[PDB]
Design a protein around this ligand. Structure first.
Ligand SMILES: CC(=O)N[C@H]1[C@H](O[C@H]2[C@@H](O)[C@@H](CO)O[C@H](O[C@@H]3[C@H](O)[C@@H](O)[C@H](O[C@H]4[C@H](O)[C@@H](O)[C@H](O)O[C@@H]4CO)O[C@@H]3CO)[C@@H]2O)O[C@H](CO)[C@H](O)[C@@H]1O[C@@H]1O[C@H](CO)[C@H](O)[C@H](O[C@]2(C(=O)O)C[C@H](O)[C@@H](NC(C)=O)[C@H]([C@H](O)[C@H](O)CO)O2)[C@H]1O
Lengths: 211, 213
């Protein structure tokens, strides 16, 4: 089949920087099309017939190519352009999509704001304690979040989740959730999360004492 | 105005069949083709097949003839039927209308289909209370299956500063997520904050008021 391969798989661009990404086809096509997908919601038609912009697509986008070789270009990267872009051919069957180029915005360092949340009484009632540490609105994505219970480092009892880049401020947020039984929760008094990030001169600790 | 919308089951067992209906408006099925696309979790887009205005069909061969597409013009409906499901058929399924360049100009919202023999479970919702000026508060949505859940705040009136985290798969085989929002601490005495949680597979609808403890 006519397999489409996109390069690079993941790229980042500074605000206002020119962006180019490519699509290679295993067999020549007369036209290449492109979609933009944000946060895994429905893709949007972005470019059709190689170089024609879909309605509402800003003029800083363009497409070009011929044969097996196509590209999509953004004259100047904007925060609203953060998305995954997919090429697609409909010149022969089966119709095929490339694997996508994920385009990220390289913005300035921003330190997280850190919050800790004890379990609700309602949840304890049912037998489980979830303790949640939030890192709000930071950049870059790399952060280290460590749990300490009565000043002992925890391991294997927490899971993290991270948002996509925010549409306007281009930052991430992260949650880390520590999960214990009600019984184990009541064997300790001090619950703390320690956050290390390049935006912070030294690690930031948020804690609470049961009571 | 062209519109498409999928309706399908969220959860289907291995070896059973998947049936999805695409209901359309703003164009005649007699005159225009409708394609189907899927996206497995964390992966790219895959074209599945098309039914043309004339009723002719074309399918991706990788489906091993397990897929059939049909339609009824007067009902404004296109039907996907996929037999003998296996785990790797888990995906968000979309219907779409070819337009400019024969590319997919209009898309349905998509419907997430999970292939599993596990039982449907609705979530429990717990508050993430603002601590005792920007305050953070939220909801913890725990122990649900399959995906997805949706969360809104104050029935959609509160959007600024909201972060709803991607779900995590727990070691139990159930999902959990949190949704948080940052608000002015000075609003806490006058503004009620309610998270609205929906899990369509279990018909669960929870509105949880979140207040200082
Ligand atoms: C005609 C044809 O061969 N169609 C194929 C289609 O071929 C395309 C495709 O491969 C594209 C690349 O994606 O490359 C060529 O097209 C070029 C450009 O992409 C395209 O934008 C350009 O369009 C011209 C247009 O032709 C002029 O009329 C117009 O003034 O200007 C535009 C813009 O310049 O044309 C370029 C080439 O010159 C290829 O030609 O490929 C798809 C697969 O992706 C199918 O194979 C298409 O063939 C369909 O076959 C089925 C049978 O299997 C049907 O016969 C179908 O016909 C209907 C239908 O039944 O659905 C007949 C309907 O009357 C018609 N409706 C209307 C309102 O006309 C519909 C409708 O066109 C389609 O459903 C799409 O919405 O098609 C064939 O289309």
């Amino acid at each position: 089949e006519n397999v489409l391969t996109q390069s690079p798989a993941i790229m980042s661009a500074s605000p206002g920087e020119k962006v180019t990404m490519t699509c290679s086809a295993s067999s020549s096509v007369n036209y290449m099309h492109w979609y933009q997908q944000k946060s895994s919601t429905s893709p949007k038609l972005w470019i059709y017939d190689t170089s024609k912009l879909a309605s509402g697509v800003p003029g800083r986008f363009s497409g070009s190519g011929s044969g097996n070789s196509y590209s999509l270009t953004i004259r100047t990267m904007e925060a609203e352009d953060v998305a995954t872009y997919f090429c697609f051919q409909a010149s022969g069957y089966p119709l095929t999509f490339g694997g996508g180029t994920k385009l990220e915005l390289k913005r300035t360092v921003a330190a997280p704001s850190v919050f800790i949340f004890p379990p609700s009484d309602e949840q304890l009632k049912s037998g489980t304690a979830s303790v949640v540490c939030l890192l709000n609105n930071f950049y870059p994505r790399e952060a280290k979040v460590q749990w300490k219970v009565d000043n002992a480092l925890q391991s294997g009892n927490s899971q993290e989740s991270v948002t996509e880049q925010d549409s306007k401020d281009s930052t991430y947020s992260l949650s880390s959730t520590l999960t214990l039984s009600k019984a184990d929760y009541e064997k300790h008094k001090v619950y703390a999360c320690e956050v290390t990030h390049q935006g912070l001169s030294s690690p930031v600790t948020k804690s609470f004492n049961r009571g | 105005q062209v519109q498409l919308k999928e309706s399908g089951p969220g959860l289907v067992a291995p070896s059973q069949s998947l049936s999805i209906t695409c209901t359309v408006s703003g164009f005649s099925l007699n005159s225009y083709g409708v394609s189907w696309v899927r996206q497995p979790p964390g992966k790219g887009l895959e074209w599945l097949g098309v039914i043309w205005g004339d009723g002719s069909t074309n399918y991706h061969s990788a489906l091993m003839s397990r897929l059939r597409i049909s339609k009824d013009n007067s009902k404004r409906q296109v039907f996907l039927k996929l037999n003998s499901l296996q785990t790797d058929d888990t995906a968000t399924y979309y219907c779409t209308k070819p337009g400019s360049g024969y590319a997919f100009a209009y898309w349905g919202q998509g419907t997430l289909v999970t292939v599993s023999s596990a039982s449907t479970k609705g979530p429990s919702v717990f508050p993430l209370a603002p601590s005792s000026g920007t305050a953070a508060l939220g909801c913890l949505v725990k122990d649900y299956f399959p995906e997805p859940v949706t969360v809104s705040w104050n029935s959609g009136a509160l959007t600024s500063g909201v972060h709803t985290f991607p779900a995590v798969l727990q070691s139990s085989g159930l999902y959990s997520l949190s949704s948080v929002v940052t608000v002015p601490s000075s609003s806490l005495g006058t503004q009620t904050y309610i998270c609205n949680v929906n899990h369509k597979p279990s018909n669960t609808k929870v509105d949880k008021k979140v207040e200082p403890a």
